[PDB]
Amino acid sequence: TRVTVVYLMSQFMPSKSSLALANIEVDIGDIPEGKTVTIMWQGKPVFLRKR
Amino acid sequence: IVNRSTFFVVKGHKNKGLIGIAGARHNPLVWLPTLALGGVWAWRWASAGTI
Amino acid sequence: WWDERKLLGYKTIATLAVIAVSSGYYNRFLSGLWRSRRLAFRPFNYS
Amino acid sequence: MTTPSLSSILRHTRPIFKETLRAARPTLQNALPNGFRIASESKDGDTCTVGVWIDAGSRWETEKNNGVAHFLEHMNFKGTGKRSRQDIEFGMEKMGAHLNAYTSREHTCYYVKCFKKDVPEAVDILADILLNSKRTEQDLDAERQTIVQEKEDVEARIDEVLMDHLHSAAFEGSGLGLSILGPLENIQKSITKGMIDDFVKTHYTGPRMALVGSGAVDHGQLCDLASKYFGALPTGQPKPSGFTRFLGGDKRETNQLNPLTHVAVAFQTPGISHPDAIKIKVLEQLLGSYSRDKGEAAYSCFARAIVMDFYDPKVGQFFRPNKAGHNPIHSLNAFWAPYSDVGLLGFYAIAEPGKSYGHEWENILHYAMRELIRVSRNISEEEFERAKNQLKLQTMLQLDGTTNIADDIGRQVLSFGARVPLASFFEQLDAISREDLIRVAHEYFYDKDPVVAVIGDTDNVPEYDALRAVTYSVDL
Amino acid sequence: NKISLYRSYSTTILLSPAYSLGFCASIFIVIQIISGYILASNYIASTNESFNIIHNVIMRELDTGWLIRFNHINGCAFLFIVIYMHIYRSLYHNSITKTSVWIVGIIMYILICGIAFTGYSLVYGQMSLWAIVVICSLVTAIPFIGNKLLILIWGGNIVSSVTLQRIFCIHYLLPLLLILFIIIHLYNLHNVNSTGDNYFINNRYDRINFYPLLLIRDVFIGSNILIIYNIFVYYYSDLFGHPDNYVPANPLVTPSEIMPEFYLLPFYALIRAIPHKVLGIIIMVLFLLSLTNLYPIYFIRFYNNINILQRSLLLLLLLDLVIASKLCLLINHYESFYLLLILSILCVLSHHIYNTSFNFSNSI
Amino acid sequence: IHLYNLHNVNSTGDNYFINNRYDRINFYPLLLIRDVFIGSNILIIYNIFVYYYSDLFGHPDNYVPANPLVTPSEIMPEFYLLPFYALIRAIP
Amino acid sequence: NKISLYRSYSTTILLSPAYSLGFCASIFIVIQIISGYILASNYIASTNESFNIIHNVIMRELDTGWLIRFNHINGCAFLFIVIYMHIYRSL
Amino acid sequence: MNDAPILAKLGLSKVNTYYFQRRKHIFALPITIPNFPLAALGIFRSTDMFEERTLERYSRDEREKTLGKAALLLKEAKEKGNYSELVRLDPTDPRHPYYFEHPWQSALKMDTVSLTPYQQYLRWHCLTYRAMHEWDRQGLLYDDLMQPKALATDPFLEEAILRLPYNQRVERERRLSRAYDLALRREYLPDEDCIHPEDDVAYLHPYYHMVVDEHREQHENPVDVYSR
Numbered sequence A: 001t002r003v004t005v006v007y008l009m010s011q012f013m014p015s016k017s018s019l020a021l022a023n024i025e026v027d028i029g030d031i032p033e034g035k036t037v038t039i040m041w042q043g044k045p046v047f048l049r050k051r
Numbered sequence B: 001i002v003n004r005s006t007f008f009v010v011k012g013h014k015n016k017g018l019i020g021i022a023g024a025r026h027n028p029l030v031w032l033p034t035l036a037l038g039g040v041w042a043w044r045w046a047s048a049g050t051i
Numbered sequence C: 001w002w003d004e005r006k007l008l009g010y011k012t013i014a015t016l017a018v019i020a021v022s023s024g025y026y027n028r029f030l031s032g033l034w035r036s037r038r039l040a041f042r043p044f045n046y047s
Numbered sequence D: 001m002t003t004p005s006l007s008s009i010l011r012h013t014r015p016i017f018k019e020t021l022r023a024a025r026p027t028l029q030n031a032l033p034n035g036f037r038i039a040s041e042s043k044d045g046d047t048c049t050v051g052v053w054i055d056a057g058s059r060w061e062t063e064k065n066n067g068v069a070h071f072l073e074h075m076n077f078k079g080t081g082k083r084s085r086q087d088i089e090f091g092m093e094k095m096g097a098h099l100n101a102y103t104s105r106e107h108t109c110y111y112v113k114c115f116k117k118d119v120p121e122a123v124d125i126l127a128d129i130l131l132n133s134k135r136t137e138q139d140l141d142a143e144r145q146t147i148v149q150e151k152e153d154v155e156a157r158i159d160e161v162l163m164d165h166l167h168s169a170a171f172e173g174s175g176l177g178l179s180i181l182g183p184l185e186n187i188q189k190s191i192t193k194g195m196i197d198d199f200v201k202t203h204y205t206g207p208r209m210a211l212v213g214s215g216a217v218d219h220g221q222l223c224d225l226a227s228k229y230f231g232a233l234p235t236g237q238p239k240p241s242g243f244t245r246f247l248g249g250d251k252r253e254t255n256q257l258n259p260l261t262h263v264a265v266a267f268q269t270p271g272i273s274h275p276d277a278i279k280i281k282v283l284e285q286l287l288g289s290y291s292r293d294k295g296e297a298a299y300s301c302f303a304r305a306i307v308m309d310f311y312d313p314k315v316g317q318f319f320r321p322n323k324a325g326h327n328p329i330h331s332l333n334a335f336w337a338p339y340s341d342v343g344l345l346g347f348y349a350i351a352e353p354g355k356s357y358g359h360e361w362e363n364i365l366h367y368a369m370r371e372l373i374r375v376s377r378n379i380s381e382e383e384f385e386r387a388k389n390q391l392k393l394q395t396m397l398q399l400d401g402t403t404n405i406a407d408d409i410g411r412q413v414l415s416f417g418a419r420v421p422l423a424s425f426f427e428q429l430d431a432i433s434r435e436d437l438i439r440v441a442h443e444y445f446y447d448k449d450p451v452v453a454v455i456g457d458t459d460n461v462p463e464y465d466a467l468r469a470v471t472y473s474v475d476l
Numbered sequence E: 001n002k003i004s005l006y007r008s009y010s011t012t013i014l015l016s017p018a019y020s021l022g023f024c025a026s027i028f029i030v031i032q033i034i035s036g037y038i039l040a041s042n043y044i045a046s047t048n049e050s051f052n053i054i055h056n057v058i059m060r061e062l063d064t065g066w067l068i069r070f071n072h073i074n075g076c077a078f079l080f081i082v083i084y085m086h087i088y089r090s091l092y093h094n095s096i097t098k099t100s101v102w103i104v105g106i107i108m109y110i111l112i113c114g115i116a117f118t119g120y121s122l123v124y125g126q127m128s129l130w131a132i133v134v135i136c137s138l139v140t141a142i143p144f145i146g147n148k149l150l151i152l153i154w155g156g157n158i159v160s161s162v163t164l165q166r167i168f169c170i171h172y173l174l175p176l177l178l179i180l181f182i183i184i185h186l187y188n189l190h191n192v193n194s195t196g197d198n199y200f201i202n203n204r205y206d207r208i209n210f211y212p213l214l215l216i217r218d219v220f221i222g223s224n225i226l227i228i229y230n231i232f233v234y235y236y237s238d239l240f241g242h243p244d245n246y247v248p249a250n251p252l253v254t255p256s257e258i259m260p261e262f263y264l265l266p267f268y269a270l271i272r273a274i275p276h277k278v279l280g281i282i283i284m285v286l287f288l289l290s291l292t293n294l295y296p297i298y299f300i301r302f303y304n305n306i307n308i309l310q311r312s313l314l315l316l317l318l319l320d321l322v323i324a325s326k327l328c329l330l331i332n333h334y335e336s337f338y339l340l341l342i343l344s345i346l347c348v349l350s351h352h353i354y355n356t357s358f359n360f361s362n363s364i
Numbered sequence F: 001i002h003l004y005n006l007h008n009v010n011s012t013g014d015n016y017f018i019n020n021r022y023d024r025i026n027f028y029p030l031l032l033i034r035d036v037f038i039g040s041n042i043l044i045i046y047n048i049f050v051y052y053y054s055d056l057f058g059h060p061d062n063y064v065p066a067n068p069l070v071t072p073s074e075i076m077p078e079f080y081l082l083p084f085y086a087l088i089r090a091i092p
Numbered sequence G: 001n002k003i004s005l006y007r008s009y010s011t012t013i014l015l016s017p018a019y020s021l022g023f024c025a026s027i028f029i030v031i032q033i034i035s036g037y038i039l040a041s042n043y044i045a046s047t048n049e050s051f052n053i054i055h056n057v058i059m060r061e062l063d064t065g066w067l068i069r070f071n072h073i074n075g076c077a078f079l080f081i082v083i084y085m086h087i088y089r090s091l
Numbered sequence H: 001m002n003d004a005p006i007l008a009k010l011g012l013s014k015v016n017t018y019y020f021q022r023r024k025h026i027f028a029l030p031i032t033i034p035n036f037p038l039a040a041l042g043i044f045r046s047t048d049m050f051e052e053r054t055l056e057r058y059s060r061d062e063r064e065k066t067l068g069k070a071a072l073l074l075k076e077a078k079e080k081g082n083y084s085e086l087v088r089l090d091p092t093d094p095r096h097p098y099y100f101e102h103p104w105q106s107a108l109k110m111d112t113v114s115l116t117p118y119q120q121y122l123r124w125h126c127l128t129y130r131a132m133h134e135w136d137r138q139g140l141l142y143d144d145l146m147q148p149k150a151l152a153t154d155p156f157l158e159e160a161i162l163r164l165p166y167n168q169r170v171e172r173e174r175r176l177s178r179a180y181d182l183a184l185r186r187e188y189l190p191d192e193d194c195i196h197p198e199d200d201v202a203y204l205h206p207y208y209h210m211v212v213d214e215h216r217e218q219h220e221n222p223v224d225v226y227s228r
């Protein structure tokens, strides 16, 4: 019963694909001081600024 | 315990419950190990680990 | 999913086998009350 | 109505139990070198009961000899070497007394109530019929029809038939679970002079017999008579000491035309001489008794729990009220049947069968088993004291008359080897503790296999399996 | 045996036309079931092509798919209107005494609220998306599991096609459970009968055959209610809706005002009037649980009569609920209305449905 | 409804007899335990197919996406509908 | 009242193990209902997405969506087998 | 009150117990639903002064009053020997120890000099609030509207009805059926048949109270602590 409940519930967890786009990493050693760079992440464009 | 006579008294309506026999119950602290083991055992997740 | 499928198969069959053995014993035990029942009829008065 | 009930607001005065202990003369007991015992309690008076108690009942049968004890009882009265049946009757009638024989599952007794001057003659007649009965084969063929008629009429006593069913169900494979009179096949053809003589030789020996005198009797004279008559009794093999196992189960007789349903539920307990006998007696008095004439006036937690179910209006939030039309219980009675090595402690309930496929007996047994569990767990001081006091009174109420006193003396002499002085008994009775009683109750009641006997409409009395599932609780 | 049909069940003569509200509710349940089954046979649940297939395929390609959709929307609205009138009547005539009928009714009310919410979610418009977002944010306040549970519920960090598919399956399933609970509702009612205008214990000589008199009365009242209902299906087809739900949902853009359907506003008010999120969730659960009659269980309780004071307070309850809904939606621009919103919520939370005989007793 | 009617008329058993209450037995829990035992055995048999013969009760052509322009070599229904299909092939 | 629970329904003693086929069919009905409800929560019905959403989403995006689908299929097959045995015994 | 002179000689009050009603507790426990959450606590209460107040019968003062009147009856019986008669008085007889009177049965002929302003308000309220409900125009007594329910039945009430004499039971039923017939058309009896407040006798409250006491009897004299 325990494993069956856990398994039926696990059918409702996030899909592996959604777990692949959730985390991304950017290289901050490329942007110089005072420059803002735009990237893509989960559709919403993201600004990285060297404040 | 409540310091009130706020209960209607009927001729033969007493010692009524749905779990056991009144006056023949254990101390409530004897179910603590059962509840602790049950909580620790049930609250666990399981995954098949499929890539 | 070949390997995970085989592994889950083994685990499920083992667990169901344990349950089946225990429940079979208990069914046989409970049937004992009826499998050994006895009857007797008080006779009539016949010429 | 229009007439008020002031008892519901008045303050009532509670009587308290006060005990009167009038000392009695000690029971004198002697033993011959043979082992025959001689016990007597003298008391001022003009009459006295003199009897012989034998420790050989129907417990020692094997379904081949079944009924031989009763056959022997009947054959003892058919003549001796010196006298005949008419001569014995003539002697008894000259003495103005009767000769009473009583056979049970463990003890038998032949007793006579007489004047103090007829004691030697009564003892002479008793010894003559017991030791020198001819028990001719032809006479054995003449009593078969009488015993058959007696079996037919005792089979018409519902309480006796119920107790016989209970003993048959509880003990299978031992003589203790057999009828005293035995089956017809044994009465009509099987029992023979050989069987009767074997039974007498085996079980009528020195150390198995007592001569009991109660009332205006002399212990010295009784001892002299015992030496004169019973001094030559053989000292045979000791009493059989086997293992009588208790088989939990059920025996149900379906008679849907009967007007009342009788249900006996019993549990296994240790023997009569076990050191728990007093605690078991206090438990029996704790469960108490009830009869229909009392109505709601039940004085035990047991009966109350079973009787108020038929006076409770049973009103609920989501369900219609379901109150019983009337009280169907005819009686409830706790009982204890002890034996040298075993016992059956339980209750006996008589109530109307009720409508077909009703719930009366379901409720009765539900509350009965609930109360047994509850007493297995917790007992209150008030009810404990009530049970002990009622046990005192009951033990005093069993000794009204020389015959009753003689029966008590004989039973205790055969069981324990000597008679326990009542004072001593009471000394042990007030030393019991509430915790000890609770432990005794829990050791025999809780989660144990009962034996159930039913007579009457069985479409309403719960089957055994259900009754086996209510000897324990989920949260206990 | 036609006669046996007439006498199968009998009721009281004091059944005013107000006792057809249950029949009207059943009518709108039937309409919802049928129109929803027709819609679901043309529906695809996915963020890509949900809003499109409702507005471009169902409505404009079928002969009268528009009429089916309008029937469904206004049927939900009128089902809630009739249920509110039904509850108000049952409170007016002291029908809490029908314990089983009342408890089944409250369960049905909760189920229908859930059905309405999950249905509104399926139109993947701006209002649907952001109502889901707000509700699921309220889920996030549970102690020690708000984020795990929220992820499990949504299937991710964001509402997506899997969330739409879960909602579609739940919306399809729940109304059938609702039908079962309606059957149980009527079974209990037939067991304990109806109250009427006044409560009397009538023998068979004072009761009337249910059929066909009350069936014909039900037909008459249902005909009038369907006239009123169709005046909205054909002439005010979006009176109960919000125009922002005719905009395809942008997860990046939040609407100016997020307002639920008019039959959930009271609940929304409870959320807005309680600054602490956990306390708001607790109050919501306690409110829904206190509408029922599950306690006391084994203590002896019985219900007495109802009086003019209680009926007047019932009118006050209605007023407070309506004002609370309106204010809850107004407070997004006007901060001073918080006083009146809180006052109305407080007045609602302290309304006596059952007058408890335990108000009067002595002390040891 | 099936179960309601059965409980109204009771079960036949191996042989048909009319029994009074003394010849009958309580359903609970003996028959529930027997049902659990038989169910566990049949679930073993069932799961042998789920994990090791997952596609034995099927036709491989259903793993080819539908092509309205092409008909399969043999159109065959599932094994449990085949008898009905036969009734259509045997009647011209 | 546990006793009242025991005696609420009684049957014959001649219920051989062949009389559990109804219970087996009930088990498989439960399995089909649960598996189908889980599948429908991930299913889109169209000629452009149906086949794909079974083999590319259900069976490869979830942890054991393949197991759920195999349960549904083989549960249907075994439900029919058990029902045929049930009918044959009834005849 | 018609009982007042008796109450006068026993050292009790001649005023109805409808006055003196007061709130002694803050929380009303056990909490009863379906009240709304705050109302379920009972901190704020709404009353119209026409509640039953049955649980206030469990008092020593009421028992003392009942036993004083009963002792008067028994003393008269001892003096005269008409015990039977004196124990079979109709509970509507002012000498019956369980005699009960509705507040309006004496509101028109009350003393009104010893009443606090709050109690004068209570008197006026009793009369007017009786007038508002219009059960006097239905040819009905207040105790006719004390009826049991199919579920969650008031046990005492049922017994209180079975203790009524046969003729009074039949008259109660006939009045209820006439009120039913009237209520079909929402009709009232002719204005000359209106029920005068002093005619609105509480014929069922004595039986109700007697049943309540008889039901509590066994609780206070238990066979044992753990007994049904």
Ligand code: HEM
Pocket (backbone or CB within 6 Å): E029, E032, E033, E034, E035, E036, E037, E039, E040, E043, E054, E069, E072, E073, E075, E076, E077, E079, E112, E115, E116, E117, E119, E120, E121, E122, E123, E171, E172, E173, E175, E176, E241
């Ligand atoms: C099994 C029966 C039902 C099915 C299959 C069903 C199916 C659907 C479907 C597919 C939609 C989306 C299409 C659309 O939005 O127009 C929908 C919308 C909706 N449903 Fe249902 N439904 C059912 C019963 C109900 C019930 C009983 C209610 C209760 C009132 C309800 C309330 C709603 C609401 C409020 C909407 C959204 C309204 C809107 O489109 O703006 N449905 N339903």
Ligand code: HEM
Pocket (backbone or CB within 6 Å): E018, E019, E020, E021, E022, E023, E025, E026, E029, E083, E086, E087, E090, E093, E094, E095, E096, E098, E101, E102, E103, E104, E105, E106, E108, E109, E182, E185, E186, E189, E193, E194, E195, E196
């Ligand atoms: C799906 C929605 C509902 C439907 C279809 C429904 C249907 C009905 C019907 C047909 C009746 C009997 C006829 C009548 O008296 O009008 C009834 C009675 C009743 N319903 Fe409902 N009901 C619904 C919701 C509710 C709710 C939410 C409650 C609140 C608890 C409720 C409480 C009651 C009560 C108390 C009665 C009996 C009233 C009385 O006779 O005194 N119902 N309902």
Ligand code: HEM
Pocket (backbone or CB within 6 Å): F002, F003, F006, F010, F011, F012, F013, G018, G019, G020, G021, G022, G023, G025, G026, G029, G083, G086, G087, G090
């Ligand atoms: C979903 C499929 C089915 C389920 C779940 C089902 C379930 C059950 C159950 C639980 C029983 C009682 C237990 C037993 O005796 O095996 C039963 C008995 C029965 N069923 Fe079914 N059944 C199904 C299909 C059928 C079919 C197709 C028939 C054919 C008409 C049928 C005819 C019967 C009969 C005749 C009995 C009683 C047999 C007897 O005791 O004499 N069932 N069924």
Ligand code: HEM
Pocket (backbone or CB within 6 Å): G029, G032, G033, G035, G036, G037, G039, G040, G043, G054, G069, G072, G073, G075, G076, G077, G079
């Ligand atoms: C409400 C309950 C059910 C729902 C929601 C449901 C839903 C679904 C869905 C969405 C599919 C397509 C996904 C897929 O093919 O893997 C499917 C396939 C199927 N279902 Fe169900 N189902 C239900 C009950 C049943 C029952 C009772 C049966 C009969 C035993 C059944 C037999 C099948 C079969 C044979 C397939 C196709 C097998 C295959 O994919 O090869 N379903 N179901």
Ligand SMILES: CCCCCCCCCCCC(=O)OC[C@H](COP(=O)([O-])O)OC(=O)CCCCCCCCCCC
Pocket (backbone or CB within 6 Å): A001, A003, A004, A007, B045, B046, B047, B048, C008, C011, C012, C015, C016, F043, F047, G064
């Ligand atoms: C109703 C009671 C009878 C059913 C008995 C059958 C129980 C299933 C046995 C298999 C359980 C199992 O293997 O779980 C272990 C794995 C690994 O988990 P983890 O601890 O390594 O994280 O966990 C997982 O792999 C996650 C999900 C496993 C799938 C379980 C399928 C259930 C099949 C039910 C058969 C009727």
